[PDB]
């Protein structure tokens, strides 16, 4: 009788916890829906602003005249100039740099694969070590690798 | 693994440099007519102001998305604790009925 | 030792092939740029093609969004059932202790 | 942004076309190395996982090989002594069967 009384009290407490967590989850779901609406409103505003800017600039950027096209080449050349440590980098001599850096890239990939082979074998060796460790732990329980 | 991580970083940088050089090679033709020029900054004022407003809207959208994601998270953990309570209550109720 | 050097060469072959396939996996999006490559060849007024590509991307993104949402719901369902089992196991184990 | 900022001036378009050409080159290179003219971006993942299994088999093989080579450091005497012990216990046996 006493045992059943204890379990009934336990169930009462669990019911109170369930009520509290249900209320918390309902509040969280309401907040989640509110934030969904707020987010969708933000993308709506962003898309509207983008479309309106497109409409306003329609006439502006259509007549590019392939004349403001070359600044893109200028930015690309400069971006390579800082990225590639070649202040003398010229579109004329940039081909020798291209081939040399491609050679370096392929060498790097080969070294990467060489490292990858040994990395994989080492990781799998550690995996078998670990498997031995789990088997030992399951059979006997906690123990160090040295005792394994 | 540390060494391979460093090697992968180096490979990525080399690939990026090679791609930049390829870009220069491709845009050599565009450089060819670099002497050309054209009119610019006709409707820049309104375009610039609208760009600024759109940037503000995009930043607000990013904040909104971050808040949405995090709230999805906390709602998830709340649901998980709710389910845990459900399971505990069901088991204890079954056990009380058995007794 | 001979067989081992042979196996190392085979592993190198596998490594290079896998790396190549992974590289194309990364360039997966770039194959979508076939439209971009064709668009760039316009060399004239091409805003309508940009809008068509944008609409196609919107359709793809909406499809991915629905896929992600339903998969998230499925994962959440799996997570609640797992948590319920966890709590049930805890309760049963505690009763076994008590008995 | 490209449509809204049409002043972008097809720079992103140029970069994307260059990326498309690079992807074409990479796909051809893989079709060569993997010798898979039958290949597509959509289904390349399947061959990628297949060759991932292939590489895992090769690496596990070479791992057992690494262990065997490492234990091969055992001098000539141990093999002889074990062989003679097995012979004395069971009788004459071949080293392969020992």
Q: Which two tokens stand for residue B75?
A: 């709602």
Task: Please report the sign of the dihedral spanned by the C-alpha atoms of residue B45, residue B46, residue B50, residue B51.
Answer: negative
CB burial readout A54-71, b (16+ within 10 A) else e = beebeebbeebeebbbbe
Chains near A, with 3+ CB pairs < 8 A? B, C, D
| Residues of chain A neighbouring D66 (CB-CB closer than 8 A) | 121, 125
* Interface check B4 vs A, CB under 8 A: yes
Establish how many alpha carbons lie within 13 A of residue A75's alpha carbon, considering only the half-sphere containing its beta carbon.
11
Query: Can you give the three-state secondary structure of chain A, one letter per residue?
Result: CHHHHHHHHHHHHHHHHHHHHHHHHHHHHHHHHHHHHHHHHHHHHHHHHHHHHHHHHHHHHHCCCCCCCHHHHHHHHHHHHHHCCCCCCCCCCHHHHHHHHHHHHHHHHHHHHHHHHHHHHHHHHHHHHHHHHHHHHHHHCCCCCCCC
Task: Answer for the pair D67, D61: CB distance below 8 angstroms, yes or no.
Answer: no
**Which 3 state secondary structure label does DSSP give D23?**
helix
The span from the CA of A91 to the CA of B26, in Å, is 10
The angle formed by the CA atoms of residues C32, C33 and C34, to the nearest 5 degrees, is 90
Non-local CB neighbours of D58 within 8 Å, separated by 6+ positions = C7, C10, C11, C14
Q: Do D6 and A58 touch (CB under 8 A)?
A: yes
Residue of C14, C15, C48, C51 to mutate, testing the A interface (most A Cβ within 10 Å of its Cβ): C15
**Three-state SS at C13:** helix
Cα–Cα dist B7/A137, whole Å: 36
Residue B30, both tokens:
């565009």
Residue D3 forms contact with A (CB below 8 Å): yes
Which residues of A sit within 8 Å Cβ distance of C? 58, 62, 66, 109, 113, 116-117
In angstroms, this model's resolution equals 11.0
Rounded Cα–Cα distance for residues D53 and D37 (Å): 21
Query: Which residues of chain A are within 8 Å of residue D58 when distances are taken between CB atoms?
Result: none
Name the residue in chain A with its Cα closest to that of D5. Answer: A54
What is the distance between the alpha carbons of residues D20 and D17, in angstroms, rounded to a whole number?
5
Residues 6+ apart with CB under 8 A from C77: none
Collapsing DSSP states into helix, strand and coil, what is residue D82?
A: helix
**C98 interaction partners in chain A (CB closer than 8 Å):** none
Query: What is the nearest CA distance from B45 to chain C, expressed in angstroms?
Result: 23
Closest CA to C42 of D13, D15, A68: D13
* Nearest residue in chain C measured CA to CA from A116: C15
Q: D11 vs A72: CB contact, 8 Å cut-off?
A: yes
């Amino acid at each position: 009788q006493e045992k059943i009384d204890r379990y009934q009290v336990d169930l009462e407490e669990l019911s109170y916890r369930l009520e509290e967590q249900t209320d918390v989850v309902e509040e969280a779901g309401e907040l989640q829906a509110e934030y969904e609406a707020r987010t969708e409103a933000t993308e709506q505003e962003v898309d509207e602003l983008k479309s309106q800017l497109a409409d306003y600039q329609q006439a502006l950027d259509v007549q590019q005249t392939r004349a403001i096209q070359y600044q893109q080449a200028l930015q690309a050349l400069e971006r390579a100039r800082e990225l590639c440590r070649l202040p003398d980098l010229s579109v004329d001599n940039a081909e020798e740099w291209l081939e040399t850096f491609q050679a370096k890239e392929q060498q790097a990939t080969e070294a990467l694969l060489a490292l990858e082979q040994k990395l994989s074998v080492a990781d799998a060796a550690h995996n078998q070590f670990e498997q031995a460790y789990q088997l030992v732990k399951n059979i006997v329980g906690e123990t160090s690798r040295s005792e394994a | 693994q540390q060494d391979y991580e460093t090697a992968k970083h180096s490979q990525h940088q080399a690939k990026q440099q090679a791609f930049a050089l390829v870009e220069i090679v491709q845009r050599r033709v565009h450089f060819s007519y670099s002497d050309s020029a054209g009119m610019l900054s006709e409707n820049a004022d309104l375009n610039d102001k609208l760009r600024q407003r759109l940037e503000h809207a995009e930043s607000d959208r990013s904040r909104a998305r971050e808040q949405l994601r995090q709230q999805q998270a906390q709602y998830s953990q709340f649901n998980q604790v709710l389910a845990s309570l459900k399971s505990s209550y069901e088991t204890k109720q079954d056990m009380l009925k058995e007794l």
